[PDB]
């Protein structure tokens, strides 16, 4: 109806929401092995799946970190209470996620490994992962 | 820079001593030497000022002059 926004604006808003959530999750969970986000939107309730490598680190003490993230997303995007749920999924064959290898190499460089050795280690690991 | 005006003065408060602006008589008679702001937000705790030509409420900002 007139209250509902047009199809074009609705799809652009969905894309904007995806991008904003992706940026927020990237900034918050970069050191936790975050790789990407997928959302299957249903009118009854929405679910947000976080693709991560260190999913046990993503899920805090008794799920405290995921509870905080869910509450933050709920407040920021104005979802009705209880209508948004966040789950975490471990990425299979993490060596093939080009994003995850980027933070791995960043971790090595921040630790202080020589750049040639770190890059060669990451390259060898990627090829070993296949 | 060399701005033509001198550095603007900043107001410092007078740092007045105890308020005590209401007196009792003959070993205690409740009496005000000031004025009361009659608004419902000023209340009875506050007191109007005693300027030379008007009275001013601290909260209600009401002014009563004599003409």
């Amino acid at each position: 109806m007139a209250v509902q926004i047009s199809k074009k604006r609705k799809f652009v808003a969905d894309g904007i929401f995806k991008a904003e959530l992706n940026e927020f999750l990237t900034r918050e969970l970069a050191e936790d092995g975050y790789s990407g986000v997928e959302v299957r939107v249903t009118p009854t309730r929405t679910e947000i799946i976080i693709l991560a490598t260190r999913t046990q680190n993503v899920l805090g003490e008794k799920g405290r970190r995921i509870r905080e993230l869910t509450a933050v997303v709920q407040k920021r995007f104005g979802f009705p209470e209880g209508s948004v749920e966040l789950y975490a999924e471990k990425v299979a064959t993490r060596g093939l996620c080009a994003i995850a290898q980027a933070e791995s190499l960043r971790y090595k460089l921040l630790g202080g490994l020589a750049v040639r050795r770190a890059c060669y280690g990451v390259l060898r690991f990627i090829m070993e992962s296949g | 820079y060399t701005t033509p005006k001198k550095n603007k003065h900043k107001r410092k408060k007078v740092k007045l001593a105890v308020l005590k602006y209401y007196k009792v008589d003959e070993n205690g008679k409740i009496s005000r030497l000031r004025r009361e702001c009659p608004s419902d937000e000023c209340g009875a705790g506050v007191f109007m000022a005693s300027h030379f030509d008007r009275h001013y409420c601290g909260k209600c900002c009401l002014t009563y002059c004599f003409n």
Partner: protein, 55 residues
């Protein structure tokens, strides 16, 4: 200053009313389809939103 003139200037329109939803920039905005996002920020998040280059 105090409450009377700090934000007293009307900002109902013009470039001062509109800023990028990402970088808080006032130039190169894209208000088509209600994006409200900077020229370069759109190039950054186009594939994330769902905008692709077909031709």
């Amino acid at each position: 200053g105090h409450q009377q003139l700090y934000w007293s200037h009307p900002r109902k329109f013009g470039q001062g009313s509109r800023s990028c939803r990402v970088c808080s920039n006032r130039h190169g905005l894209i208000r088509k389809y209600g994006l409200n996002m900077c020229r370069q920020c759109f190039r950054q998040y186009a594939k994330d939103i769902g905008f692709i280059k077909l031709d």
